[PDB]
Amino acid sequence: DIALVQPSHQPLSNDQTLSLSHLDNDNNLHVSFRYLRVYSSESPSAVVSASLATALVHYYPLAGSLRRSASDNRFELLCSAGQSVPLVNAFVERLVPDPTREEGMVNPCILQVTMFQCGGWVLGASIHHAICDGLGASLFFNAMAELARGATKISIEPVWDRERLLGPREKPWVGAPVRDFLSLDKDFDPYGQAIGDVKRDCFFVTDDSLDQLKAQLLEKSGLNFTTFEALGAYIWRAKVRAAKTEEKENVKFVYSINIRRLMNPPLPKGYWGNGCVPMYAQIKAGELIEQPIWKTAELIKQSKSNTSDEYVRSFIDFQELHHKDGINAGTGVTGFTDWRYLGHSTIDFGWGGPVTVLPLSNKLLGSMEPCFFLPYDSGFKVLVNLRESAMPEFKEAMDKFHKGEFALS
Template sequence: MSVMVTKSWPVLVRPSTPTMPDRIKVSPFDKPVAFCAFSSFLVFDRAIHEPAEIIKRALSRALVHFRLMAGRVIVGDDDGELCIACTGEGVEFVAATANCALEDVKLFDPPFAAVLGDLAADYPEASCRVTDPLLLMQVTEFSCGAFVLGVTWNHVVADGTGIALLLRAMGELARGRAQPSVSPVSCAEHLLPDLPPLVAAIEQTMVGHLEPQDYSYLDFTLPMSTIDRIRAELSDELGAPCTVFEAATAVLWQCRSRAIMPDDDPGTLAPLIFTADARRHVGAADGYYSNCVITQAITPSPTIREVADGDIKDVVKLVRSGKEQIPATFAGKEQAEGVPGVDALFGYNLLFVTSWRNLGFEATDFGGGTPARVMGHVGPKSVPACVACLPYRDKDGANILSRFVKEEHAGAFLAELAKFM
């Protein structure tokens, strides 16, 4: 059947009580991602009464605590300095209804990419303008009572952990708590250091490479049995247990490298860049919701043949080595030797992985239980990227949404992936 989503006219939801007007200088972690939009989707398969009204009221109360999110970006006329003005102007909110049940939309069965655009409010130009709200929310209710919460935000105001903190707080307030269980902290209360030079260069270059790409949209789950087998094979070789992220990323990296490896140049590099939460490295307080994520490159980058033909244990060790470089990066001891020019990292051979494991989206509960599935949308303007380890109640493993292979390589990638199942 044809799915039709009918949207109400957007309204601005303001803090339920006035907040202190202020002008907050954004941190060095916020600047590289300013005006980049990202969307997340929380799929609730259990009905609650009037979900849009409940969520709208909870949002209004939560904005009292997350006051930056109700403000607007301002750019200094003289110095171009980015700030967030805590104006209390509010968050754009849309209530919507679908003409079908949730199961008819097939959000649990790929392909569903065409449907996602209808389930979230979006910025007019697919990127954020100075005058736009920092946060857009849409609640879409289905005929069966299920609903989807779509959240789109200007990345300057929060990272994924920050948005998850907001949503968890909204759920707590909706269920009757007087205050969020975790007190929100932003760049207004906690000063962060400058980004390490290599990290800053990578992030600035990555934003410059966000261009429309004709990549295949893939939704798949790496079973926990596969992950556990890899972890068992490594046993004590890493000095600490292999993580789900390390195992899943290694499999993605190897399968993709095998699928796209050129016959005439197997010695070309296969860069891997991944996001890492830097909160503990910079001493950020619990509840910090402004950006505190870095993009970490594995240096030196291996060749595509080394990744494709190597033992999976060695590929896991490469991923672990990238994580182990993070403390030295913040200590000013970056290993520049063997690192190509940053621009050289950004081609089709690049793999960018961002993990949503343990960010907290899965804890959101507006009274009917936690989401059956959480999705992050990798838009058409992207480097080869995937959102990994997404919460998915009925899937035992690491759910992954990706746009990182051309259509001509999608079949080969899935065939390589099947070898690990």
């Protein structure tokens, strides 16, 4: 059973093509991001279709179709009256739609509500990553949630204005910290690498294992690292090691940061497009599998150095210059995404906050083996997508961690 939800009240009089920002049109984001929310305890089917319909008054672009435009290969978003977001009513893979490129450009936002008699239900979503980032999506979902809870109007009104706020410079200019991560190769597909079948697996990590880990890196290097730095170091090393990567292959650690607060001037509060740029560390595989973790952890710590206004403006301008030319960060890229402490909590439709949340996409940040830190004696889940050949050695690495045999050099 699949309901085609249109806006409650119709906002568009005549058609409307919006362009997307230079961050939106990054080739790494030509993918459908797939995730699901679980909840316990009018039915959730009905409650989310009503939220959806009223939020679509303000978020009507999600209803729209992406296409390529003949002048360049950039996406623009066609919006027209009659457009609708599909709501599917209803192993884990069947819980959120898996649209192919065409279906994903045709329906860049697709929701699914699976109820089963065991109280709970699941909300699945398949949003094309060019439309928006995780903060953007979460503006959209908190807006639906708040409307479900009886809100009078949406509390933050969404801002488009994308080609204006995140456009290129009239005289484009790209700095060394962008040029040194990236390369041009029209013939390279970050997501088409022959690495065998990619598995998904989950590992619990205890707040106490991490504190052990930081205390020892501190004793041996006099720096305190963040969980992200220390644990990311450890997972990166373990991954590259298990993939038996050739010693002189350049490997990379990539993560996404929110730049909204950091621009001059800051981005609007209502801004729901892509408002993240990828940050990197790179090193030879051999150096990584054999240097101490404190060095690798330090290398990641130093990468947020490049978090600045100019770094973002460089990245955009690089895309102006080379969109048609195959921009990529090459092979050996591992993506990492921190999810531990977003506000999952407030996407409350009536049934409380989601008891667990789960990303299914394994193509992200120009990686095929992206890793995610998922929300909460105490500890959190680490999800790793890793090629099948590497996964047994990797399980053993996480089991050594679990037992605090960290192998620090």
